[PDB]
Amino acid sequence: CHELSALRIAIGELLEKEAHDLLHEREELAPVLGQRPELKRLAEAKTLPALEEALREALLHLEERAAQEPEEPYWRGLLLAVEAMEGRLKALRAEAEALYQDLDALHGRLHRLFP
């Protein structure tokens, strides 16, 4: 579940969680970051785009692992879980995006209602 941890860390940083709150997630991840650079990039992503990009990288690795060990349904369960979350992450980004665009129109709207 290294993918879920790394992802929880990035969202945590974005929410400024107290360091101790992400303690065990950083401990589980620490040892595998060497063999997996994407996990490191994922945990430290600071922008949504970079977050999604690092996540896509992690899904490739997970996809590979699942194809290599077809007998263990756990990997296929992890894939489905990471993908569901990716969907929610994209949803969060679309929301920020919508907010972004609406900031612009509103500005134009104020101008017209107050010539």
Number of helices: 5
Q: Which CATH class applies here?
A: Special
Chain oligomer state: monomer
Estimate what percentage of residues fall within beta strands: under 5%
Order of helices and strands: HHHHH
- SS-derived structural category: mainly alpha
What's the CATH topology name?
Helix Hairpins
The biggest beta sheet, please?
none
Distance between the termini: 56 Å
Global geometry: elongated
Q: Report helical residue fraction.
A: over 70%
What is the annotated CATH architecture?
Helix non-globular
How many runs of DSSP E, i.e. beta strands?
Answer: 0
Count of discrete structural domains: 1
Radius of gyration: 18 Å
PDB class: structural genomics, unknown function
Keywords: nppsfa, National Project on Protein Structural and Functional Analyses, RIKEN Structural Genomics/Proteomics Initiative, unknown function
Assembly: monomeric
Entry title: Conserved hypothetical proteim (TTHB059) from Thermo thermophilus HB8
Describe the overall structure.
The PDB classes it as structural genomics, unknown function. Keywords: extended alpha-helix, RIKEN Structural Genomics/Proteomics Initiative, rsgi, structural genomics, unknown function. It forms a monomeric assembly. The entry is titled "Conserved hypothetical proteim (TTHB059) from Thermo thermophilus HB8". This protein is mainly alpha-helical and 115 residues long. The protein has one domain (1-115): Helix non-globular (Helix Hairpins), CATH 6.10.140. The chain contains five helices and no strands. The protein starts with a helix and ends with a helix.
